[PDB]
Enzyme design. Structure first.
Site, short mmCIF file in Angstrom:
data_model
loop_
_atom_site.label_atom_id
_atom_site.label_comp_id
_atom_site.label_asym_id
_atom_site.label_seq_id
_atom_site.Cartn_x
_atom_site.Cartn_y
_atom_site.Cartn_z
N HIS A 138 0.80 -1.22 0.00
CA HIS A 138 0.00 0.00 0.00
C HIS A 138 0.85 1.29 0.00
CE1 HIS A 138 -4.13 -1.83 0.72
NE2 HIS A 138 -3.41 -2.80 1.26
N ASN B 169 -10.45 -2.48 2.83
CA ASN B 169 -10.10 -2.52 1.41
C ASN B 169 -11.39 -2.26 0.61
OD1 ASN B 169 -7.22 -2.92 1.14
ND2 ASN B 169 -7.43 -5.16 1.30
#
Ligand code: HEM
Lengths: 498, 498, 498, 498
Positions: free
Chosen positions: B56, B128
């Site tokens: 990420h 997510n």
């Protein structure tokens, strides 16, 4: 392997039992704290990443050999450059501004960082794909690189910021011209030239000194992409250059560069009509012709990119006998900056990693520190000592120095007869570029100015007219029509930019 | 400012004299070692970069507010979710695999990391853009993320590596299906949903427990890009999503999401036909309908991306009273992993930076360490103490736990009646997707397999036929014709890949 | 505090539940991985320690005030030293060689590190309890400090190593004499003097320059311990000096020092018969009398030793307008070394910790980095800029510099008329010491040489005879009888030493 | 060495020119920034120090061999303990509370950290000089060690803090008794015993399990110092134990210890009258006699203390097949804590340093990170893979585990028939100590309580009477007379303590 082996180990060498399931209280229960394999593997995973380089984060490279094929011993005593010498090399190529994951085909300077593993130490020629740079004093370098990166609030690159910096630092014009020309977008690293950019000092066996420039001329020629081609590739293959180099070498196509130097007698450094100690200047090849040295060949890919390329640590401070620095302020700042960064980026013992180790024996007065792999045993930690552990103590003038005289000051370098900020840029535009290259240059610069805040645009029109009246008016006309190329890697305008 | 001011200072607050020229011996002489402003500014420049997140790395975000508009107090005592409560938030969005400079529009999972600055601590829902994940045990997570990143020699992403991992870990099929479908390429972060993915525990004021799922449904709808559109944008604007969010908020367009939960009674967690503790499973909304909680609005951009976004440190361990973890092994691993990474990435005192500080008073038994900004004075360092410095000592069963019984083991979770690796993926392909989405899915998966080593392709055909016989044969047919879309961010084949 | 409070929190501000028991599967079961309070508290515990200072690890300090009571404005424009000015201070005292846990009463130099929190920045006078040092070029400093620490194999301090270094570096004689005399063992920090040691530059409002020495004369007098007393205290109370200072201030006994300067006109720096730029020399008070400035009072203990003392970061580079450095090579090396060490010891943002923050506004071109507490918002990151974010650009000679002329060299400083290595040491022994101090000096030096390897002893006899023929023969006689004091902190001989 | 050699090199292997003079503009001019040898040597000097261990900072050690001389194969399959096996070892000894420079002869626990370089990995038995510890749950360990160190304001150790913690944690009584007895002050490390303290699991070739205790009985006997002797030595020779060990080995006197185990059948672990999983308990040798294993000999000093001793990284997680952990909560916390600390103290790649490397081949799924010396080439980074790079995947119950059943809780361990906090302490005082040892114990404890705040003293009288009514009254009587020994390393009272 061992009687109780399972297929892999923990960090202590004991069988790991499983790389696929955690240690739980029954199939349905929680993971226990003492799943030491889960802990070791996740804690290492969490420490894989290291700070990316600043600048030149995005890059790759290969190993090879340099072969001397001429005699330049009258200029240098350096072992690496004596007649017939063959030396192992490592070359890392890179962009400048973008981060670890950015596309290879953004418009940018490219790095050309070349290590020679010499018999008298690692010699690093940390070059670029241009013979000049944007600046002549290292105090400005931090500002420049930050201006090439991201706005502090939105995190976007911004051509307004870039041009605000360039127009307010007109010393940048020679290199901005080069960057905005054809060579801002190499097709491959194999198809660009490399340069030392700075003047360095070469010292011969008798102590005589020459000021030298390095030029690595690609045997594959210089081949470039258009803005539109490079933008397309940035989307389709962000690692186009990295892939090209690795594939080329894997197939057996070993790229080559011929090294030439220019050599200025010591006393002429002070008198030449362009300042050889100003990184924004080239030196005429009519005045100081290129002299061939030998040929660089790349012939071997890394087996581990992170350990051999990402962890490589190059520095202009890595001179060897026969090669020194020069009065170029930029180079003198670089002598400090790389090693400093590497202590943080990699660690205190960066130079003990295999890729950074010299071939010859190290006998250096440095001890202890984190991650000390190759210790010094019971060697003395101080000098002089009465225990036979040698040290250095040469006194008097060094062999690779020069003279200075003045009061401590912060001011621009004095101008030589022909020094200014715009004239060499103007020669590049008027005399070196072709008509088609000039046409493309106008489209590039006009595109680079599209959406830039108007105050900054107005300053840019003056900047470009100072380079060349004709090119500057062509650029201004096109900007006022709102035309020009998209520039891979940067734009201007909108509510998230200046 | 001060009598001797020059326009800027050094780090000690004294006038800096110049941000533009170094301290030299006359105009032509060397830089002196004691140019302390040059040293401070370059040494800081050399320490600006910090390790990027793994995974990420590439992302951005904004601040906002959550407003509770329903009554879910029968399920949780958490202050943030009591009737009428308004709470400040921070949301960071991201991709997964690419590094700091990679394009926003690569095909990938997106992060949805949401902090609530509650009156009983910072509550982080680190979600997510999908309700499931690729794996059900954290031992595999390291392997998965490495397989999504780069080959060890060439440094290229490689679809062969990706598919070798996925096909050998068939638990991945539900999320690979979701990823390869429309939602693998959100048009903007404003136009995707967020999910907690895991089952969490909610505990009410009386101590009763429910297992919960979180669903953040975008008020802007779900809108996606084609592979070809996303590839084009990756070249033209690598920061498209970052720019979109900042511009949207700057103009006053504040994106919203409605939060719904599913709530499973405690005892039904053990008996349900899909394992709620398996992160590869969704829970039927016919069995457990969505229950509205309230609305999230983003309304404020960062003023400093690095300090407020890059330095933000989210963690699933940041629960608050009324909200706990669950028997999901993945979540239990996450409870350890984030804080661990952040100690390295940012520092021991990461949670003292303003963006990571809670709103309520911290009274924590932790002292000293590097970069200790907010010290504890003469407070006792041990417990119990006779000096009036309070501590915690609740004994017995916790309010946010559960039961376990068994021998220490490393094995797959036991299957519930309807658990398998392929059935929910098959429902997604057959029943959820439209005909056009299925057509595009075939082109995507076939493209993702183009150039993949044939052994791995053969395993992938079996994998996809296990998802759905028809889709699997369509994919195989197209792969055997050497057709399919280019996938933004990754390819296969050639001498630099498997 | 909060509705669900338990007496303490985790790092996110949520109730911690227990500071006394871990989270287990039943009373008898294992600890679960997701005991996040156990993890946070142990991971912080494991990161409490920071590298100790090198040198000067062992020390403590207090806050206070400096009051100017004289007019030295004809010599300096510095705000802190203008008539009547009162300024908050911090003073850290220390030994040199020993580590964090070593006894306070070892024989050693003491540090006298004084910060003034001025209205034009933090001004640090980083002094010692002696007006001279052992060396005159910083290249030797690393060797010296290592020689004062431990042998590489056995980890013991070793007087043979110490004397091998000193005798081979005869520039050390002045300070070794001072160290081996009465003042090597201060009774308390309150009962020793402080000195800047180096020549500094003072610059007045009109730009006129003087070379200055700083002298802090204790109002409590100079009081010392014998070797035997200091050895006894080292065993009974390893923190005797730390305890003394804290107790003194706690009871309301505030120690004081009067500051005096010597002032040499600019042009006389070049001509004086002792080199004022040689740190091994004092300047005669007959030639340049002491001139009173004002009085330092310590009046406030730290509330947190680690945050306010251990994390304090002093540097000679922290000059303010009116005060500069000098041609003393040692000082020029110090300008680099402290800040460098602190980036590693504490962190890049060391100067944002409260104790290191200036009182006046910082406007510095440095951004990002780990642990960035006080960010710069959307301020420009480059200069010049078109956004109103100021910078410095003074051009030409600085106000706090000097002249130089020569070739780059590595050689000893040129000798002034009266410069040598032994004469000032000899004045100290012959003319300054009393008869009893000379008697004790012989016992000290002879003891310091007991067990030293004989080659090194023989060199030491010559060294001491060069200081003074009589003292040297007395020392030699006593060493040959195997007599002399035990020296607190170091010995020689045996199978674990040279 | 090389044609242009000078006696030493820089870090790149090039001649350094001088280790004794800096690079200046003429003899009298400033140091130039580009003195790269000055920079490299000072920047390394500034990074020599690493965080000291917490706890056990002060220590030293030696290499040796373990020889198995008995047959314990019915209890363990571990290679290191099979009949006749000889294995290289490393043993580090230490105190607990004091820092890097503290005296060796403070009253304290001593560490006994023993590595076996086995053919199936490094096996670490990280023991102490006592069979028990102060605590039975690791949540309390941080508090305990902080209470043994320094007050937050004054930076002094404080017996009031120590006793406040001990009296409020009565589980400490067994080990406080041992500490305050004769063995709190070993004469040398050669003259103390070592113990594993915890119960560990041994697993034989057939999978049968026993719970084991380790006992290392010195062949030099157990010999101790009085408080007064140890105080005197702390002043005269702060490194007495370090020096003793190095000298002993240098002369050829190799100290030995005989290893014995106690072995409890698996099922009896649950039923025994003292909890073998409670670290505050010993196990009766009448119930479970000692069984000889073999003999440890130390025979080789380090050649580099910092690289071989300071940088050694031991961990209870470093088990090998045949040896596991146990339900002892303290041990389960230790499984996490050491490796975690070492990532910060030394670095991510701590286990690649020579002293921490196993003898057998490591095949571990961990890649990249700072200071990666021994890289994995092109090995697969994920599992399963189709490239022949092996992994582990054993499924089901592990060989070195146990059972658990319950709800998640934070509570004291359940008491076995004979478990309490005071009874084993009382046996030590009444039955094990001699009359003279009891007399000295009263003087020690009374001295340790001198000056302690009276509330804490009153609690201590009750604590000691709970151990033994007679000893407690003797202690109280002596404390009320203001008599007792000075305790080396700590005191109480005065304005700088509680
Ligand atoms: C739950 C309780 C404990 C925890 C969390 C703990 C933690 C630690 C930590 C973090 C270190 C420093 C490690 C390093 O930086 O390399 C250490 C060192 C040490 N501890 Fe423990 N400890 C505990 C109990 C014990 C016990 C019961 C023993 C003995 C049976 C012990 C013996 C040692 C020794 C000998 C060292 C020094 C190792 C060396 O010489 O490098 N500890 N401990």
């Amino acid at each position: 392997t061992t009687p109780h082996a399972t297929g892999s180990t923990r960090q202590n060498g004991a069988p790991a039992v499983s790389d696929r399931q955690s240690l739980t209280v029954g199939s349905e229960g929680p993971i226990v704290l003492h799943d030491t394999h889960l802990l070791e593997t996740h804690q290492h995973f969490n420490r894989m990443n290291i700070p990316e380089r600043r600048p030149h984060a995005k890059g790759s490279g290969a190993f090879g050999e340099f072969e001397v094929t001429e005699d330049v011993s009258k200029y240098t005593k350096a072992l690496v450059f004596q007649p017939g010498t063959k030396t192992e090399t490592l070359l890392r190529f890179s962009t400048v501004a973008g981060e670890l994951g950015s596309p290879d085909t953004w418009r940018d300077v490219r790095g050309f960082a070349l290590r020679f593993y010499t018999e008298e130490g690692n010699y690093d020629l940390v070059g670029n794909n241009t013979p000049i740079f944007f600046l002549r004093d290292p105090m400005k370098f931090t500002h420049f690189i930050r201006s090439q990166k991201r706005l502090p609030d939105s995190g976007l690159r911004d051509a307004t910021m870039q041009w605000d910096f360039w127009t307010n630092n007109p010393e940048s014009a020679h290199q901005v011209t080069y960057l905005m020309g054809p060579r801002g977008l190499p097709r491959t690293w194999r198809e660009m030239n490399g340069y030392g950019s700075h003047t360095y000092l070469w010292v011969n066996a008798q102590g005589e000194k020459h000021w030298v420039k390095y030029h690595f001329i690609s045997q594959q020629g210089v081949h470039n992409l258009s803005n539109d081609e490079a933008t397309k590739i940035a989307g389709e293959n962000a690692d186009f250059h990295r892939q090209d180099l690795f594939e080329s070498i894997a197939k057996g196509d070993h790229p080559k560069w011929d090294l030439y130097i220019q050599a200025i007698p010591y006393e002429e450094g002070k008198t030449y009509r362009f300042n050889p100690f100003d990184l924004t200047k080239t030196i005429s090849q009519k005045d100081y012709p290129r002299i061939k040295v030998g040929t660089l060949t790349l012939n071997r890919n890394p087996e581990n990119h992170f350990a051999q390329i990402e962890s490589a640590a190059f520095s202009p401070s890595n001179t060897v006998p026969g090669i020194g620095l020069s009065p170029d302020r930029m180079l003198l700042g670089r002598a400090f900056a790389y090693h400093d960064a590497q202590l943080y980026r990699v660690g205190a013992h960066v130079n003990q990693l295999p890729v950074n180790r010299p071939k010859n024996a190290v006998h250096n007065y440095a001890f202890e520190g984190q991650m000390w792999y190759d210790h010094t045993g019971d060697r003395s930690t101080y000098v002089p000592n009465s225990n036979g552990d040698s040290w250095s103590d040469e006194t008097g003038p060094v062999d690779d120095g020069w003279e200075a005289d003045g009061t401590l000051t912060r001011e621009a370098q004095a101008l030589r007869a022909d020094d200014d900020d715009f004239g060499q840029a103007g020669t590049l535009v008027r005399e070196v570029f072709s008509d088609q290259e000039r046409d493309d240059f106008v489209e590039t610069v006009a595109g680079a100015l599209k959406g830039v805040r108007q105050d900054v645009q107005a300053r840019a029109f003056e900047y470009w007219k100072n380079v060349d009246a004709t090119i500057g008016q062509r650029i201004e006309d096109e900007v006022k029509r709102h035309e020009g190329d998209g520039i891979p890697g940067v734009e201007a305008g909108g509510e998230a930019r200046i």
